[PDB]
Structure formats: C-alpha cells, structure tokens
C-alpha cells in the first residue's frame, strides 16, 4: 500500500472476513499508530489478530493507543553502542583473519580520487568474505 | 541586597543562606535544649558586638523582633532567651520551647546590610531518626476523561508527612528513566501538626494515561522507607 | 550506557536564545525516548509537553510548536534548543534527560539543571573570598553552626562539591525561591561531619556550568 492512508477502517474490515489474522505493519510508527487506532474503535484488538512488529515501528509515538500485549522485537544488536561495537569489532576482526588465513588476499591498488581503481578481485574476495 | 523577604525554610542541604546550621532537620527537638545560632565570617563587628536582630520567623505567623544586637531583649516579648554568646557565633539557648517559639531565627545583620536574613533552622518532627517514622498519606485523586482532552490532568497524589528535605519519590513502576521527577508543592512548614504534602502532579495527556501503568505514587524517604503501593486502577471518573 | 547528566546552561541573559545542551550520551538518540524537559514551578501545574525524534519534533506545546526550533547536533549526540520569549512560571527546573516515552516516574535521585532569567552581569561579581573560621565554641550536639560562606556567584542550581571530594553524608538539592538580584549566598552544609571540635576544616568547592571554577575560598 501506499504511505499515508485515510480509509484504514476498509482495510481491517477486509481482513476481518478473511480467514487470515495476521496483521503484518513495518513501515513506519505513524501507520502503526493508526492501524492501532482503527483495531481500537472496533475492539478487534488482539481477539485473534496476531500483531508482529518490531521496535522500529513501536518507537516514537505508537504505543499510546496500542494495549497491553502487543508483541514487539526488540531490535538486538541494532542501536546499542556499548557492547554492539565491541561486537561488530570482534566479528569483523574474525572475519579479516578467517580470509588472512584462506586464499585470495591479494593487495588491491590505491584507491585514491580522480584515478580507476576497480578491484578486479571484487567478487571474489566477496566469495572469500562470505 | 544578599537575600530578598522569602517566607520559606532551609532549602535543604544545599540552601540559598550561607548562615544555614543542618541539612536535614535540627538534631535537638521541642522538649529539650535547642540551640540556635547563625555564622558571618566578615567584618561585621562594629564598635564592640555586632548587630543581629533575632526574631522567630515562622511560616505564616509575622516575625516579632524580642532580642537585638545580640546583646539586648526588645520590649514586649518575656525574657526567656539567653541573650550570650560574641564573636563569630551568637548562641541563643531556647529552653522554653512552646509552640510558637519553635520558628527560624534569621539574624538579621544591620552592619554589611540592613535588609538582609540570616539561617536558622526550622524545629519540627525529626522524623528521620529510628524513633518516629513519616508517615505517608497516600491518597490519589481521580482525574476525569473530560480534562484529559485538553491536555490537563488531575493526578495529584498527596505526600502528608512524608521528609521535606529529601524528597525522592522512588517510582515502582516496571520501567521509568527520570533523574528527577517530583512537583514542588510543598505547603508552609509548621510545628504543631506538621501536615504539609508534595503534590506531584504527572500531567499527561488522555493518550498518554492509556499507554501509562497503574499510577501508584510510592513513597520512598530516609525518614521511614517502607513500600507502600496504592494500586489506583485508571478509570473515568 | 546510563549517562542522565544535564549539562546545559543554566544561567543566560533574559529574554536571550537558550541553547539547552542535553549530554545524553546513552544507548541511542535515533528515536527511541521523548527526550523533553518537565515545567515544575512552585505556585502552578505544568502541562503536557511534547517529544523529540529522528526527525527533530520541535513541537512541545501548541504555543510553541513553531517558535523553537531543536537542532539535531548528531555530531556529540545531543541538540540544542532555541527557547526565545520565555515567561516566568515556564522558566523552571529543567529535567532535559532521557525521558522514557509513556511518562510512568523515575528511579533515580533529584538531578537536572534550573535556568533563570537573571542577567549574567548582575550573577557575575566576583566571588568572596571569605577564609574559613572553625568556630568550636557552639558544643550543642550533631549538628552545630560551622561550613563555608562562599557567596557572590552563579546562581543556586549548579554543580555543587566539595573539597575534593569530601563527606557527603546527607546531601540533598532542593530548588528554592531564587534572588532577582543575582546575590546568590549558596552554601551547602552536612549533618554528622563539620561539627566536632578541633582543627578539622570542611571548606566548600561548589563548580559552576559555565564557568568550571573550583578554587574559590
């Protein structure tokens, strides 16, 4: 659909008389808001609708409306910067020394400006890294 | 010029007096020997002994000037202060200690500038000890759906005797993040019944009261820290 | 992790544009908490304010939804703020941390920085050096009349500390009435230390926000 609905109440209504209950919303917190709210006015707010969202669309200003028992995921991983960097650090330490340790390591030139420095081992070392 | 005419106590430790003698309530009580005493570490005496005006400012009772300069009792006040001490301190051992008598005492200086205030500390219960405990009188009131419309809520939560000088408000609620939430209402202190509550009012909007949990104002304080939870169920009233 | 510290300037000129620098430093800025300050003033109620976002909602009340406008200085993680024409009872203490969105309390203690509306000349005269006097003489009992008297400065709601790191049994903030004046006679005191008798010395070191001077006697 398109970003930035007025007639969400058709919607709920359609998927009402479906046999499907599995209101999908990941596109923003303002749609997730308003779908909230249309599940509200009808009380159809958990009563067999599974609500599967993610912390993305559950921050700013979703939750006002939504009760509780709404399932949200927490975004592990995704927007600490304590641990999170330390993590990624390690992984990607790891990763340079799994491909130190295997083939194709060959140095590319300098990639410096105004100059062509297409890696020709691109894919590749892509493969290797994977 | 230092300090304007502010008809409130000691603000806790970090007051706005340099003259301030304890953070929390005065160690000594009504009942025994209550000594209280202002400081001035500057060139405040002037031919002799300095020039202190002592009088009992109690909230919401006018002040009455009864000894002056330290050294001499006014006219119309009984004598029942020791008027000693020189210096730097000013002793005034206050034996009788009625119900009127326990007030702040502000030395007002007349020597660096007349128009001043001194420190002093206000006597009350001291509830903060193992002795006696503060008490609090949880009591929320209902706000109604129809304010919540406009922004204003009526979630005020009365803290009778609870500790004026620390007042920290630990919320048990299953997760808030705030350094620092608690609305000061604290009305005038007195020495008779000491009925003086902190209405923290949280307002939020009709949104915000539904994504908000049982509002269960819990008071935790040094004086008497003991969980007590009112589970108040939102509803419209 | 946990950094709630308000490090704004607290003392501005009236009528002047208050930058508010909100130091967070937390978790993530990337809209996830309100991020708002709280309007508590002795004498009136507050209101319902607004909250902050990705795209920088700089829309707290409906009077001033479009005055402010809240830069989104993602360089130090934190933004400033563009109050202009402030009144008295919303000049308050400011509570401008990290804000859980749902407004349930705090588990905390009593922080946050309390802007006034003095003029930062009339604050800033110099600051009294007074030496400090032990008065060993007033033997009443726990607690007695000795501490600092270091006066002449940034207003009250300021960083206030020791001697280096002293006692600090009973420390507590309470924001009070403030002095239109500037004269602001801050001066903490503790409650068991600093009143037994000998040569101990207890002299106050209170920092300031925007100054950082601490070797004022």
């Known amino acids: 659909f398109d970003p930035g609905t007025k007639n969400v109440t058709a919607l709920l209504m359609e998927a009402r008389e479906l046999e499907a209950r599995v209101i999908i919303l990941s596109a923003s917190e303002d749609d997730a808001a308003t779908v909230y709210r249309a599940a509200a006015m009808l009380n159809m707010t958990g009563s067999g609708y599974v609500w599967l969202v993610g912390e993305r669309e559950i921050s700013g200003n979703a939750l006002r409306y939504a009760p509780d028992g709404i399932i949200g995921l927490q975004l592990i991983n995704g927007k600490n910067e304590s641990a999170h960097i330390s993590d990624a650090v390690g992984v990607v330490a790891q990763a340079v020394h799994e491909l130190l340790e295997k083939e194709n390591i060959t140095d590319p030139p300098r990639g410096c400006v105004g100059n062509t420095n297409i890696w020709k081992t691109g894919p590749l070392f892509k493969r290797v890294l994977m | 010029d230092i300090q304007w005419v502010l008809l409130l106590w000691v603000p806790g430790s970090t007051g706005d007096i340099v003259l301030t003698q304890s953070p929390a309530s005065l160690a000594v009580s009504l009942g025994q020997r209550a000594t209280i005493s202002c400081k001035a570490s500057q060139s405040v005496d002037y031919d002799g002994n300095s020039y202190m005006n002592w009088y009992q400012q109690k909230p919401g009772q006018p002040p009455k000037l009864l000894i002056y300069a330290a050294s001499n009792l006014e006219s119309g006040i009984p004598a029942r202060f020791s008027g000693s001490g020189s210096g730097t301190d000013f002793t005034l051992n206050i034996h009788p200690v009625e119900e009127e008598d326990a007030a702040t005492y502000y030395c007002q200086q007349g020597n660096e500038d007349p128009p001043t205030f001194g420190g002093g500390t206000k006597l009350e219960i001291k509830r903060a000890d193992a002795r006696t405990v503060a008490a609090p009188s949880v009591f929320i009131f209902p706000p109604s759906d129809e304010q919540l419309k406009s922004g204003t809520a009526s979630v005020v939560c009365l803290l009778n005797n609870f500790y004026p000088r620390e007042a920290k408000v630990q919320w048990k609620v299953d997760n808030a993040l705030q350094s620092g939430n608690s609305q000061e209402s604290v009305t005038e202190q007195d020495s008779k019944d000491s009925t003086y509550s902190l209405s923290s009012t949280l307002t939020l909007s009709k949104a915000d009261y539904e994504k908000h949990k049982v509002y269960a104002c819990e008071v935790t304080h040094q004086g008497l820290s003991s969980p007590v939870t009112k589970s108040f169920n939102r509803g419209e009233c | 992790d946990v950094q709630l510290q308000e490090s704004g300037p607290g003392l501005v000129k009236p009528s002047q544009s208050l930058s508010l620098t909100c130091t967070v430093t937390?978790?993530?800025?990337?809209?996830?908490?309100?991020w708002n300050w709280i309007r508590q003033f002795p004498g009136n109620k507050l209101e319902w304010m607004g909250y902050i976002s990705y795209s920088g909602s700089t829309g707290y009340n409906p009077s001033l939804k479009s005055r402010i406008s809240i830069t989104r200085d993602t360089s130090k993680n934190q933004f400033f703020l563009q109050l202009n024409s402030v009144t008295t009872e919303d000049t308050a203490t400011y509570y401008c941390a990290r804000l859980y969105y749902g407004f349930y309390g705090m588990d905390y203690w009593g922080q946050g920085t309390s802007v006034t509306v003095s003029s930062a000349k009339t604050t800033t005269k110099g600051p009294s050096v007074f030496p400090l006097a032990p008065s060993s003489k007033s033997t009443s009992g726990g607690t007695a009349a000795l501490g600092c008297l270091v006066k002449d400065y940034f207003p009250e709601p300021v960083t206030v500390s020791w001697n280096s790191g002293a006692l600090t049994s009973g420390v507590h903030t309470f924001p009070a009435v403030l002095q239109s004046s500037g004269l602001y006679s801050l001066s903490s005191v503790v409650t068991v230390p600093s009143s037994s008798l000998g040569t101990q010395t207890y002299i106050c070191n209170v920092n300031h926000k925007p100054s950082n001077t601490k070797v004022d006697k």
């Open positions: 937390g978790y993530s800025i990337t809209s996830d908490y309100a």
